[model samples]
Target: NINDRIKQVQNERNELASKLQNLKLQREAILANELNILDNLKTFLNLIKEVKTNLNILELENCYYSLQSLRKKMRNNAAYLKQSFNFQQSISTYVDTLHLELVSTLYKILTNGFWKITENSIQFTPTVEWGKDKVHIEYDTFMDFVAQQYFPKGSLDNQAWFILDMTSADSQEQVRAKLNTIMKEYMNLSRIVSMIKNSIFISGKEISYENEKNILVFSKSCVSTVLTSFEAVCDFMLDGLAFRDRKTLSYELGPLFNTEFTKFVKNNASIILESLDSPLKNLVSVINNKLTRLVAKSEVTNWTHSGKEIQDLLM
Candidate 1:
């Protein structure tokens, strides 16, 4: 009877020992999880606060400053508004719209303005199509076959229309000398115009890639506008409209403006016009990445990944 009683008491004691040990493990796990969950909530809330802060300071503050100042720089001293335009298949990935528009407009203005042929001073808008006598615009000649698309229907009727007038100079050869001389004098202007034209074409390509598939038209419109402007200046000089000493010529091909700069300014309020660089681009990527991380981490509040049972019980 004593032996039987000893065995029965031992079995009961051992059963409870294993159960208590298991209970100790579970309590420890849940306790560990409690500490971990509190840590997660704090971390999550901190990230949420950071998202708002970054959005305000990083995005809005900079954009506002950029809009105010860069606009001033480009409009004021656009020539020296130094920024290397980097073009690629998808430039939007690296460039912001404000910065892109600024650079594009600056070069576009330069290309259009550099060759602007004024009638002593006449206001004209670039990219404005001139009227034409389009009916029977061109004709078939007997031997030479003279019709060409270079000066199409709606041309030869614009303000820059000039005929050879040798009264301002002497002979054709003498006028030729003036034209060639002026050409060399302002040869640098040609390069800037070429650069700007190419720049805008790339811009148009990208813009069309975004919108109504009208890129070629936009590209041609800009390219031909520059070409036409260049031709107009050449025609003006050739026809003796710009037949002055090199003194006047010096200030004409500007690092200057009427409102923006025959003119120059350093944040000059008298005129208005805009560039962006690399670190500014890096700023964009920073914002994009931060938003992505914050979005992902919003769902990451499950801190006790290793303690699934504890999480289940708590849930």
Candidate 2:
């Protein structure tokens, strides 16, 4: 009877633990989401839809009237067309802003998750190499490094490279945890990118694979290429670049297709780019200044870090 009671108590504890675990996970997910902004966006979209419905109704009633006074109506129609074009452009800008937000959110998740999960770690991929030595790559802070490198302009191979040394396992059990980390980070990034392209921009590009045998292999290659480029960006910022080159560096950013004022790219670039927040040109200017300084500095030794110092290094 004592054992039975003990067993009953154990079962109840287990059930409580499970519930607690689920709630904790849900809370994390919710914190990760920007609920206030999302709610505002939904309201904005609904309002637009209602306006469109009213416009349609007005058009339906005005058709006969339009035909009767066709010439005068033509001017009004032209004006309406112009107004539509402006409205579309405004919506497009807003949607792009939204896409940028999603990307920024994913960047935060990837960087923070990598930092939290690994203790100054390194990962390896079984296949693919960028240089001749198969220069076995390493990452102390994988997600933080990747966030700086991610750009919508680059090819898939480029992005795939980042995942290289990061993914490998002999058995399901051995890799399950790492796989989970990878999935949670990159999957979030992939989802954000996919969402922006489909619902927001209708950009019509995808990063997934379709067939067997080639499926995982192909994605690995593509992500690795991007990973390599991202690392290169870090290298250039910390080594090859110099403080004097910040303005010229701004010119270099034109290729990335991100305007500094737009908050999404601004924050991401600022973090990796570090001091992207200079006075002359929003965030990119500061990014250039910092990157130049990082590259020019000979030694990172004696790098005393507190709040501002660590933040400077990540820039």
Candidate 3:
């Protein structure tokens, strides 16, 4: 009986020793995991500090290269930034990092428009994509850009307009400032003139020639100033007709100078109300000369349905 009791005690002691070994292994694993976490934290801190230091040096040493260099640096470290975005210190950093790419994409929109002939002059309609929304921007803005930037003795002030609707839900103020900065790099006096529907913001005044929604207007003196010069008048008329189909001419421009001009009564009240007066005759004459010049320039094979339609509408 004494020998059996001794064996039982020995077995119980062995079981306790095995449990103690397992507990030690568990404790070691826990410590190792904690140490790994500490190491990662330290590494993350160092990386962030490095980013800030380089940014500061770029800003202080060479301002001309600062913005450009900073963008590259941020992009290079974008993966690290993605991980760090969870922390408070890195939240603003992440936003700045994303802003440049977004602005760049938005800026390329201007270069995408193609030129088309309208009313005997060249007009370009830009397919502007702001985020996911696609918008057809009128030729007036491009005409304005060409007139103001390319023309030596330019008379028009060009206004490029946008509605502030970023697909990414970010800080509105930051987005606005970034957009303005991008625009000012290309042109001057960039501003937000009006805000509508919590999403739309126009860049110019409505009373001006440019107040049309989603339309960028070229800023010039008056309708008289536009009409007086042959080139300017041709450009104005061309761009004016680019947006509408030829069928709307009777409703939009009034009767063509053909037989319909003699039917001058209450039915033609729209033109009368515009008070174009005697200048209308001069405009018609100028339009006819411009049309003749354009028709002479056009090739028979190259003629478009839009051109034929417009000619018939005018006739």
Candidate 4:
């Protein structure tokens, strides 16, 4: 029995020793797994840090290039502005000759018109006879004198009269100022004009006449100028549309002209009626010319017909 008891105690001791060795092995394994997990976490954190640094560097580089491009553009803009200013100054300095030419041409057109019209004298008989046994007789010399003084006289239409007015000094000054404003909007205006001047060699066909003759011709460039001139002329007329003595503006001028002129007349019909006498007769003649012109154009515009011509017109 003693020997059996001794053997059982030995067995229990051996089993406890084995269990402790197994526990030690399991503890070592758990520590090794924890170390591996910590190393992997450290590697992951390093990778995230590297990615953030690369992103930051790339962002800064992109910003630098973007700003550099913007800076270059700004510099170019400044240079262009400075160049334009210098060019404008140079042009203005030389524009005195152009101004003088403009003044001379305008003065001649107005003053010379008087001489030309008088040279081509035509008889006039009034619709209503002032006295019995006589056509409404006015001396040609007196009428011519009146026409020279009042531009609306002896004109084919209001356009001619307005052109006569535009030839005056005050009118030319306004036109010059207006053209200056328009030129300022285009940077290459002067340069383009200069280049065109050297190349534009087309000239009018020369014609021989027994007597001196005056004629006008338009080239391609002149066609554009004519259109611009027409617009400017119409604008000037419409500006006067508000004047008490001025007449109704033409529809061919624009919708704005007709609407504005109608409004002016509606507001000032009584005043117009009162101003027919005195120097206002000359002015009234201008107004009458405008109204007559507007009427004529309106009639032409409103005319309707049926034909091949109409089809062409529709086309």
Best by TM-score: 3
Candidate 2 lDDT, 150-263, residue by residue in tens:
322222222232222222222222223343444444533333222222321112222232122221111122222332323333343344322222222323332231222133
Candidate 3 lDDT by residue in tens digits, 136-250 = 4444454344334222242221232111222233544555565555444223211211111111111221212221222333332233232333323233334433332211221
Q: For each candidate, what is the lDDT?
A: 0.29, 0.33, 0.35, 0.33
Model 3 reaches what TM-score against the true structure?
Answer: 0.24
lDDT of 4 by residue, 1-315 (tens): 223433543554456556555666667665555444444433333332333333233332233233333233324433223334654344233233333333333333223331121221211121222223333323343233323422333222233322223324554455455333322312112322232223222233111111112211122332223223233333333332222111222322334434443444345445544543533323333443444454443343432222232123222
Candidate 1 vs candidate 3, lDDT winner: 3
Who wins the lDDT comparison? 3
- TM-scores, in order shown? 0.15, 0.17, 0.24, 0.17
Tell me which residue pairs clash in candidate 1: 74-273, 74-274, 75-273, 75-274, 256-261, 256-263, 257-261, 257-263, 259-271
lDDT of 1 by residue, 240-265 (tens): 22222112222333122122211112
In angstroms, give how far residue 115 of model 3 lies from its true place.
18
The C-alpha stretches of model 1 lying farther than 4 A from their native spots are 1-66, 69-96, 109-248, 251-315
Question: Any idea what lDDT model 2 has?
Answer: 0.33
- Determine the C-alpha RMSD for candidate 3 after optimal superposition of all C-alphas: 20.0
Which regions of candidate 3 fall more than 4 Å away from where they truly are? 1-94, 97-233, 236-283, 288-315
Q: What's the lDDT for residue 230 in model 4?
A: 30
